[PDB]
Amino acid sequence: SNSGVRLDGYARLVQQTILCHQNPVTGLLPASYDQKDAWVRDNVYSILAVWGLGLAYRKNADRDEDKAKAYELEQSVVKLMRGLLHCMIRQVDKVESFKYSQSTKDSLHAKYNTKTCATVVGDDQWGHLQLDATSVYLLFLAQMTASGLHIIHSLDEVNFIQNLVFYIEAAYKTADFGIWERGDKTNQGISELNASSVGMAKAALEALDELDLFGVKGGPQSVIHVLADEVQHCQSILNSLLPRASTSKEVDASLLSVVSFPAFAVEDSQLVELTKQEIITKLQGRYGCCRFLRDGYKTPKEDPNRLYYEPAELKLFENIECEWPLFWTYFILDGVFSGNAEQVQEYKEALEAVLIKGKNGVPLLPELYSVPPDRVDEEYQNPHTVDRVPMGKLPHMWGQSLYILGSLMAEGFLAPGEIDPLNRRFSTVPKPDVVVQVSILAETEEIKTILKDKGIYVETIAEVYPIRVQPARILSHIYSSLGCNNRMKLSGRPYRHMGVLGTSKLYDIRKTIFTFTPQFIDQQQFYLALDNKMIVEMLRTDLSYLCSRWRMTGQPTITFPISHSMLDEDGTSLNSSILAALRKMQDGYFGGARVQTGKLSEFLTTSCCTHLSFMDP
């Protein structure tokens, strides 16, 4: 069959290009050239082509040769992921120490060595802070686990994954070195927040909400729980942080990795189109797109054997920046995934010309194109007019792997739903509406009698014995004991405040339904809870916030108890503000949300319930 001929041809190309450097014993390929070093992100991105080819081969089953090839590819990707996983285990102390007090001198080293899985660079000779690599590793591990592959093998592995997820969950308020490991335009030993990092972390957290690492045979003890507040905060930070690249960078081509096929961590498709148009206008060239404005990577000047560039780049690195075809490959993937056909054809036609042939006429993607030192003033005066020459790592496994995956997807041998079993392509589908449910509770019999006198039917704290109401500090303390193991010296999730998006969610502990009041009614913690107007106003704000995103499954449920500190001077009737708020509640409208008042038992029929297996004796 012609399809079989094309498949074996692609297998030959991938074997001659990437799989030839499989590096047995460990399974981590070198990062091209004479480097003898393994990058987590580079290996993870390179293994995508092998995973896609294995998925394509698995479809043509019922033959010994095809079955053997598919098994070999799957076991190869599994071996690579196990090697990277062992490398990550080799720094459990570093991860645990980073869990408290986030600092650049605490994160695991991004540069990992070859076989024997050791550290090749100390803690001060390189920037060992890259949340994007870890987040994309988690996302791809989740995607293949959902596909059917087995990678996680032990309970201690699940505990380590949970601890590392807790470590990466704080990416929205920390400064890292970014994908380029250089911070801002000037290195100067400075790190800053990056949109790519937070987007990747949010996507990894979302993709890892409930999934079981053990597959179908796994039980409730092998599931991983992630909070809802972190994902929404990351999404909000991304929304407020995407008119540009970062605080100092006006535009970066790495933003394409956030608003496209990799991790699909974006909404508001109009913003996506605007960002793509800005990137095209400010970065597109004759041999790919540039990284970002004012970059000095691989130039015929600025003393290449030097670091810590001084602020003297007024015009030295302007208009002569190198261009990377891997951005063209990313554009090809983005076009071929969602809905585009003509764009894919035009981008493939453009990319075919910049390709450089190799041994036996094998396609090879050059790392970058650089301007000749002689033709520099001409490029200054006439932008995008001079001709560049291919430099860098000629067998760039990153760009080559993405190009191979894009070609396989475009040829029709693979479907968009195979690489993404989690259905992340529909992340841009608008949400129609969500209805939030509220429950009104009475602290004492007098409160219930007063409410009944005012035409309000409520229930006291008693009579609901199957359900228990407790402050959110209790669930905070409970979640602080998640992923706790004494053998590998893991302290579990650090204690932290709990928002409103999870307190509304129902929790099942020891076969008992637990409902918790929101944390903002705690007068003991701080005194803003005393004021009536502040309480009703911020309750409206929280209701609005809950009604806005509500990314999680199921209906919500809010419990509002009536305390004795909210009564009038005589202590015989409720305050005017609270009474008006509850009257608006009964009318099914308050602020910008729709609510339906009812009983907790009625809401129990349809709501989001989470079971905590780690609390079992």
Add this chain to the structure above:
Amino acid sequence: WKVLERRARTKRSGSVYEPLKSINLPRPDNETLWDKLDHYYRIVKSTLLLYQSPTTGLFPTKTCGGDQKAKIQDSLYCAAGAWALALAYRRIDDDKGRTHELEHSAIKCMRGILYCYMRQADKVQQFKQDPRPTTCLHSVFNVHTGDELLSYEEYGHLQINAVSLYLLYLVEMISSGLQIIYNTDEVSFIQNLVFCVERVYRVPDFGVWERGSKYNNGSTELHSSSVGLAKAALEAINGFNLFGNQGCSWSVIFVDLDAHNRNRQTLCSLLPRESRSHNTDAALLPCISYPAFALDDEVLFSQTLDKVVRKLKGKYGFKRFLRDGYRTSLEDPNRCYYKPAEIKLFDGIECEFPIFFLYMMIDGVFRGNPKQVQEYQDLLTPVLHHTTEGYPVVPKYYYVPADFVEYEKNNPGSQKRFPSNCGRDGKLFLWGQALYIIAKLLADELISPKDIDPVQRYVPLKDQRNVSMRFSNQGPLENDLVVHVALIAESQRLQVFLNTYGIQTQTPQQVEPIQIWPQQELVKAYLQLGINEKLGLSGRPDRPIGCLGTSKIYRILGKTVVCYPIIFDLSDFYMSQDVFLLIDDIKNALQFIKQYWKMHGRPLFLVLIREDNIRGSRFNPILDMLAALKKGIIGGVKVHVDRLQTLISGAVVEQLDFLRISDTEELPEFKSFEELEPPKHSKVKRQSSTPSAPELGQQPDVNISEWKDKPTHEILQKLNDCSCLASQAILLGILLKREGPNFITKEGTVSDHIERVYRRAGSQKLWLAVRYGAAFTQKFSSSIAPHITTFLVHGKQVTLGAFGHEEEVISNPLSPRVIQNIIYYKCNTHDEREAVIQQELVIHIGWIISNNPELFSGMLKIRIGWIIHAMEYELQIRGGDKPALDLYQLSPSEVKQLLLDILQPQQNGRCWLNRRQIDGSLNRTPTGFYDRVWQILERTPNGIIVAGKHLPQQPTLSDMTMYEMNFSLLVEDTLGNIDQPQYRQIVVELLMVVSIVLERNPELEFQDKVDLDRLVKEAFNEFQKDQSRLKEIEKQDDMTSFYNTPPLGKRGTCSYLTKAVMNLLLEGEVKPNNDDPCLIS
């Protein structure tokens, strides 16, 4: 052995360190294995292989007289013996060219059988459609030319046991390693033979003895042995490769799980007996022994073996069955058929077959019981005969001499019997000598049991763990199966709506690599399997696929195929319009899958959700069911939910490569399930439930009794200006009955009008109008036929008809057209709603009996009309003072609920009259009632007369036995003449009283025939006199007050019944038993 072997203590005693081996061990009696094998080869060559036609390789049944007929089972057993001898001789490298001869002899016998069967392909084609004795394969062929000899009018030729045994032996030989199947046309013929065998659970067969029954009157009946052999053959060939080691994926054979499940269900119930007329029969031994081993229970096997040993065992052999007249002294060799009461003369002079000693020896060596082996060998030594050269001969049977028949009858086993005609030199019994060779080889350890059983037909009690279609991984005593469940959303809007309520669902657009197919495409694909234009082959018949067949995964043309259960599709009836019925059916299917799954791997269950089944008030039950499924356990069955892509990964897939080999120029196109696009007119985005109340209530003012003779224009204008749905349906039905369906009304044709009104009534949940329209349109349900087949499998008879009127019995399964004709042409005098209610009742009772057979224990036949009267009376009682509402508007959910309350074991509470009415309507009798009736008939001369029907005593006692189901059927037929259920209950109680009185008092006997009506009348008169004396109440007609009396306590009905029966008994003579020492009494 050890210690004695060394003997190397040269100096006193001490530790020795030298090799010993085992060749130096003391040897048994000095005789090389070559000598014994050559002796066996000579015995075989001089007795078995000396009678074989070179042209066809079929062993003649007669060794002299130039007989041309040749049976199939004898040839199969001869081939099996030759193969066993070849396996014995395989143990020697220097065989001198003898193993090849024996293996060829087996191959040639099988090829002759195959050629004889393949000469009749049109017969196979006809048997596939309508299996009948007229259109069945012949069982005897010419030994010299392979031609048919006996016609259907003299032999019947209906024997499926031969085909099953041939298939099983072919499977065993191919697994052991042989070359018998050569071309693909042979594979297709084997496939069609499997198809013909696949429907053995319905067509009766004449049995192994060809006589048909114990009476031998040209009647066929179901036999346990045949069913067991067919089931064992079905298991043996499940997925077997017919080409041996040199085979590919396109040489495999296929069977469906539904037929095997039905055969197992039919076997596991009739197993303790042989048939309806046979309590015990020696032909059940092959079903549970060496060849078949089809009974994987170890308890029924032991019970049946003990029963057979207790009944049929004799000194000279084992009797075939009780009261048989084959070659007996009293038999008349001039009539093929027997006569009533003549069979009784064949008691105590039954022939004995020595081959069953051989069979029990084989079973003993297979099981590992050398005590039984040596006992049966010792019993077999004196009966054997030798030729001139000394070769042993097994006589076919032994018959008592005609002069000693009286002495044998007086003292069984006292007289001596004579050997059969084939029990001396000159006439040989090839079957007997073949089994003798096999058993002697097995006993002498010359063949290991594994050698002759490569397919592992027999499994030890500790290894009944992992066998396909036989045992589950838990074992034979546990059932905790987990069923994989995957939810499917009709559309993306449906997926979003389910997601908003905490339920995760997938759409067909999200599983692009996996195609979802309905049952029709799978049926069409299986139809194309057995195509052979050279001979003429129609392939698998167009039949539906059960739940077991839809739980697998198929790879067709390189594409993964998954099929949802047939429950999720609706065609014409309104039973699918109730969500509760759908949930109940899904739970029933889950329970059936859990209980009857024995394959490898967790079964796949697909759930289909449609937008039309969630609208309105029915949203809540669907959400509750989906939440229960997501929880993990639903209806006592554990389930798991996850993504379909993850589920399909790493699972065992079924391969169908016959489509690739097909020579059709254009490959057939199969239509997979496609996502439904959202509408562009209304855009209903799965709105809320919105219960509302746009409904009213009115009782129809039109009945067929008055609006019958009205002329056309008046009824036309009445229909035009009316608004009641029921009245419109009644008027349209009257128009169809009188004016015609093709008449054009104001709103079109009458047919279009009735269809539209039925559809709107179903949409608006108007059950009365829906049932009226269904009754008047003569609609039928395709599920009626499988339910009736399952009903007749479980041994329960069915009667169709209105209460207190003509009814039609269904003794054997019938085609859907015939049952539709019966149900639609036997209730014309009554309203047609009775047919619809009978169909609903049949469906419901079929489902519960398939799931909970214990609810219907104690009843032999089920009467639908009596159950209708039963729940009518139940609802009338429930209404109390207020009149009952109806019976045709409570919806099938409440109908099934009321049936469930009715079928409860006990309804204590309300007065005994209601209990007696319910008991009579349900036709329930206490356990052992038939045995007591038989005892009474034995102790009562001149028979019993009940409601005009009379039950003689002479022919029933002469022909029938104590535990025969035919006697139970006859008793039920006699007692069914009662019209009042209370009268039937009183009859049953009087019968029990008579039985207990007779058993407790053996002396008194009935002088003449008893009449139950007189006893009932006397009991009523005594009760009336007692009531008049006690309470000064004037005598009143009818027994309304008699039934209310409890049947025990102070002056109960039992007291009057026992007084009456004792008064009748003491009228007759009293015979004193001399055994009892009671004197002056």
Add this chain to the structure above:
Amino acid sequence: WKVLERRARTKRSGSVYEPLKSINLPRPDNETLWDKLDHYYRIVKSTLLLYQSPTTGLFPTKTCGGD
């Protein structure tokens, strides 16, 4: 076992012609296989699987002293 299982001679003694199965057979001491499997799992988890290095999966010969 056989004969003991049937116990269906309602009236004196006679031949019973009913299915018997094996689920109704007399059965051993009150303990399901789940309890025994859980006991063995607890024993192994507190004894053997407790000593395994996550990095390599190698059980150590000495359980104390940091060997």
